[PDB]
Amino acid sequence: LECDGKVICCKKQFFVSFKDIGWNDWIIAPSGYHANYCEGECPSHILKSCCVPTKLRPMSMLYYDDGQNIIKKDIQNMIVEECGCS
């Protein structure tokens, strides 16, 4: 359930530039990733439920390791794909 004008429990798609976080230097690509946060109301039986990321997905990355060494990895659990209720 992707979001729009806020009402229930949805997923909020927000993008962020690494330059804006101070990380645009050790990372060659991508330029930034998707912060997707779960925001929304939930039904009650479940005791109590909260909107939470129900699924994560990998983000590919090309950056430098500490030895000014270029690395390429598929970063695990970095993008919140879907939101569900606890």
Partner: protein, 92 residues
């Protein structure tokens, strides 16, 4: 399926082939391919090439073109089998 041109400049230490890669595809989400290099004096040095996971920045790009101007390490993204055998530079 989606496969790509594979290249590793640091293949030796990392004990990998130096150069085709088949994209692992996790449950029908777009698949792309990349290329990275250097335009140091007026000479291009490869760094790496291979599959690249769903990137909002790679879709519908049939040709691998680096848009970023004046970087240390160039990088381009593309969609389409072996779309990274060729790569270029376009500042804007």
């Amino acid at each position: 399926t989606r496969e790509c041109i594979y290249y590793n400049a640091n293949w030796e230490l990392e004990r990998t082939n130096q150069s085709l890669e088949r994209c692992e595809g996790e449950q029908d989400k777009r698949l792309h391919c990349y290329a990275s290099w250097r335009n140091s004096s007026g000479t291009i040095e490869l760094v790496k090439k291979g599959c690249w996971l769903d990137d909002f920045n790679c879709y519908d790009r049939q040709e691998c073109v680096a848009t970023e101007e004046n970087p240390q390490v160039y990088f381009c993204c593309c969609e389409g089998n072996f779309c990274n055998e060729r790569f270029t530079h376009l500042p804007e």
